[PDB]
Design a binder for these strands. Structure first.
Length: 505
DNA sequence: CCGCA
């Protein structure tokens, strides 16, 4: 035929993974814009989604919120399909300090960037493999909404492949520079005519120096700021991005959508706010604003067919989706934990009671508390009762020590950080379940409750004086989820057992 | 997490 996906993995889809793959692979072909996978912390997800890719045969973009997370999605995917195109398009700066300017302290910070080649390599390999074959999975960070050169001009200038994504022809360069001088003479009159003589001197000096640099030696530092003039697109243009280097029938998989979609949304507003101060003071031309990441409007506007993957799918996902695609049943047959809501009335005494019993049956406990000194005031309080305890303000080793048994309890505050799916954790205690907050949001609770779903004796305790709506939802949702899981195990004769794992040195 | 010496 041409190019197509070859799944590799020593297991078929079990759980309700098949049900989900069907419902998704369908909605895609059935011509559905958005789709939300509502899988449970500890189900198929990656395998489920790998299958949705290897049936529809589309070039896919996997967008993760953080890099560690992208590195695993890739790692796996570049092992799930060891004979296909799997790419890693993320930021390529070991260190980066954008050109800024603190107006109060009159502090112009300069641009300081430390490139990393190994990642730069992978970025070209992503954009170049995207034009060569039509079976490709690119695991991307949020840098995929940031600016890149027009994709026609990319391949429309190719022998074997360009070593830069922003390669502007020299008939253009000549015309562009003139357009820059012309903008400069305009801004300078505007500034100078509103009394901002100082700010016009700053601008004239920086821009003329760059303009010369360009004329002399084809480019200059901070060349980015002139990107639009160089691409000779009119003011206000929407940047070309990695999304544009994809076919029109490409797939988007936003992993951890409830945290990724917003991150991806916010980017633009942060950039503009800094650029605007530079523009306002003469550090830059107004056109520097057209060198930027996409607005979320522009991002959704470039989407072909997207699939939001989340245990706690956020508002946006649901609002623009035909219900969801639940994926509750775990291959292990494990259930969402059982939750108990108990008085704060001498809770710290009670909590020490339950933790004894966990140590007795060789089991671990995680505790979240709403504040940093509240936790410190617990860690000691548990040491008071002689209990091997930890605390989270190398770090991968303290959790590794937990699983091994150095510590019996691990106190924290945001247990939501990655690295806390210990299968040894039989108890998760949520202090201040009712005291409003982010970590006591309907979704934050549900995630934290999830930190009990690895162990077959998982149990959640919520310490509160009142039941909030938040509590009530997570509690009611978890109930429904355990009920469904428990009814499936009856049917398939499953007896849930903790997922066997170990740790290395 | 982002960023065209």
């Amino acid at each position: 035929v041409e190019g197509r996906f070859q799944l590799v993995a020593p297991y078929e889809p079990q759980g309700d993974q098949p049900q989900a793959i069907a419902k998704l692979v369908d909605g895609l072909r059935r011509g559905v814009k958005h789709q939300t996978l509502l899988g449970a912390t500890g189900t198929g997800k990656t395998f489920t989604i790998s299958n949705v890719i290897a049936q529809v045969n589309k070039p896919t973009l996997v967008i993760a919120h953080n890099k560690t997370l992208a590195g695993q999605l890739y790692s796996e995917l570049k092992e799930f399909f060891p004979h296909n195109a799997v790419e890693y398009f993320v930021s390529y700066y070991d260190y980066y300090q954008p050109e800024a300017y603190v107006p109060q302290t009159d502090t112009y910070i300069e641009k300081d960037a430390k490139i990393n080649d190994e990642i730069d390599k992978l970025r070209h390999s992503a954009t170049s493999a995207l034009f060569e074959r039509r079976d490709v999975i690119i695991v991307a960070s949020v840098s995929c909404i940031y600016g890149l050169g027009s994709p026609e001009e990319y391949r429309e200038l190719v022998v074997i492949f360009p070593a830069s994504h922003f390669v502007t022809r020299e008939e253009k360069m000549r015309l562009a520079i003139q357009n820059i001088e012309q903008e400069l003479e305009e801004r300078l009159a505007e500034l100078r005519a509103q009394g901002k003589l100082l700010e016009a001197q700053r601008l004239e000096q920086r821009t003329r120096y760059d303009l010369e640099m360009m004329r002399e030696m084809g480019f200059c530092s901070g060349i980015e700021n002139y990107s639009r003039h160089l691409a000779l697109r009119p003011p206000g243009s929407t940047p070309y991005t990695l999304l544009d280097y994809f076919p029109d029938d490409f797939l988007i998989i936003v992993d951890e959508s409830h945290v990724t979609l917003p991150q991806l949304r916010g980017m633009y507003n942060g950039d503009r706010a800094r650029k605007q101060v530079l523009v306002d003071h003469g550090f830059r031309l107004p056109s520097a604003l057209d060198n930027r990441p996409l607005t979320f409007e522009e991002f959704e506007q470039k989407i072909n067919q997207i699939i939001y993957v989340s245990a706690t799918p956020g508002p946006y996902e649901l609002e623009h989706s035909p219900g969801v695609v639940e994926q509750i049943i775990r291959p292990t047959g494990l259930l969402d934990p059982t939750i108990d809501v108990r008085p704060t009335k001498g809770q710290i005494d009670d909590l020490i009671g339950e933790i004894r019993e966990r140590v007795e049956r060789n089991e671990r406990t995680l505790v979240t508390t709403l504040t940093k000194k509240m936790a410190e005031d617990l860690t000691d309080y548990l040491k008071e009762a002689g209990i091997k305890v930890a605390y989270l303000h190398e770090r991968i080793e303290i959790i590794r020590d937990l699983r091994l048994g150095k510590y019996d309890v691990l106190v924290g505050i945001n247990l939501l950080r990655e690295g806390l799916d210990i299968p040894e954790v039989s108890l998760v205690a949520i202090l201040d379940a009712d005291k409003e907050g982010f970590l006591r949001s309907e979704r934050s609770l549900i995630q934290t409750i999830g930190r009990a779903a690895r162990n077959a004796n998982g149990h959640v305790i919520m310490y509160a004086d009142t039941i909030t709506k938040s509590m009530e939802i997570a509690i009611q949702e978890t109930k429904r989820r355990r009920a469904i899981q428990e009814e499936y195990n009856r049917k398939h004769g499953i007896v849930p057992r903790t997922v066997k794992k170990e740790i290395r040195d």
